[PDB]
Amino acid sequence: CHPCPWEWTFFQGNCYFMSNSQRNWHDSITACKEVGAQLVVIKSAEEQNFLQLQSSRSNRFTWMGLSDLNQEGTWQWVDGSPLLPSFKQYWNRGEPNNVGEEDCAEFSGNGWNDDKCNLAKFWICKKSAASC
Ligand X SMILES: OC[C@H](O)CO[C@H]1O[C@H](CO)[C@@H](O)[C@H](O)[C@@H]1n1cc(-c2ccccc2)nn1
Find the binding residues for ligand X in span 69-128 (CB under 6 A): 95, 97, 99, 102, 108, 113-115
Q: Which residues of 26-48 are buried (b: 16+ CB within 10 A; e: fewer)?
A: eebbebbeeeebbbbebeeeebb
Distance CA 42, CA 93 (A): 20
- Name the 3-class secondary structure at 24: coil
Toward Ca ion, which CB reaches closer, 16 or 112?
A: 112
24 counts as binding ligand X under rule CB under 6 A = no
How far apart, in Å, are the Cα atoms of 84 and each of 15, 71, 87, 94, 122? 23, 16, 6, 18, 24
Report the interface residues with Ca ion, using CB under 5 A: 68, 72, 97-98, 102-103, 113-114
| Helical (H) or strand (E) element with 64 | strand 62-67
Q: Is 95 annotated as a binding residue?
A: yes
Total number of residues binding ligand X (CB under 6 A)? 9
Q: Is 113 annotated as a binding residue?
A: yes
- Residue closest to ligand X (Cβ): 108
Toward ligand X, which CB reaches closer, 8 or 63?
A: 63
Q: Is 40 annotated as a binding residue?
A: no
Closest CA to 96 of 107, 87, 83, 105: 105
- Name the 3-class secondary structure at 53: helix
Instruction: Report what 61 binds from Ca ion, ligand X, none; CB cut-off 5-8 Å by kind.
Output: ligand X
The annotation places the binding site for Ca(2+) at 95, 97, 99, 102, 113-114
Give the residues lining the site for ligand X (CB under 6 A). Answer: 61, 95, 97, 99, 102, 108, 113-115
